Design a protein around this ligand. Structure first.
Ligand SMILES: Cc1cc(OCCCc2c(C(=O)O)sc3ccccc23)cc(C)c1Cl
Length: 150
């Protein structure tokens, strides 16, 4: 996974954390950090409407999952894979995956389970990169993500 994986995890966990708490890391990267910031800016921008517009499907999804603990979060992978894989793959679908992650993360802070946010982000990244690796590489990874939403 390397650089695409490292970059994806950094963006998605920071995004899920900011959405739940606070917030800001104000922390280094400091890697391919120009790309990461821009992607974090666009995701913050694009993620905006998406959460609101799907407040209904999201709420429906959330009740249906009944997430209460760390063991619950660790079993979401295949349901994630089931809703996300088969179809058109495009950046809107990817932002919906991550936006729902943020939605779940906020719920996690609500039931006082902020500690599950990080394994949640890790799980989402693992699903994003394993099911969409070749599409992602083809789109210039996160650099391309910004252009589609400029
Ligand atoms: C079960 C789950 C699914 C996730 O995203 C699936 C892909 C995005 C998506 C859809 C899609 O790809 O069209 S429809 C839909 C409805 C509710 C929530 C998300 C969603 C994302 C997470 C974090 C979890 Cl836990």
């Amino acid at each position: 996974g390397d650089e695409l994986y490292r970059q994806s995890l950094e963006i998605i966990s920071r995004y899920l954390r900011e959405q739940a708490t606070g917030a800001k890391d104000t922390k280094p990267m400091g890697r391919s950090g120009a790309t990461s910031r821009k992607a974090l800016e666009t995701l913050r921008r694009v993620g905006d409407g998406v959460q609101r517009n799907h407040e209904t499907a999201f709420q429906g999804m959330l009740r249906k999952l009944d997430i209460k603990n760390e063991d619950d979060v660790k079993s979401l992978s295949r349901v994630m894979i089931h809703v996300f894989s088969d179809g058109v793959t495009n950046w809107g679908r990817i932002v919906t995956l991550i936006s729902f992650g943020a939605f779940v993360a906020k719920h996690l802070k609500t039931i006082n389970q902020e500690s599950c946010i990080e394994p949640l982000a890790e799980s989402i990244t693992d699903v994003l990169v394993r099911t969409k690796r070749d599409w992602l590489v083809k789109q210039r990874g996160w650099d391309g993500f910004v252009e589609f939403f400029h």
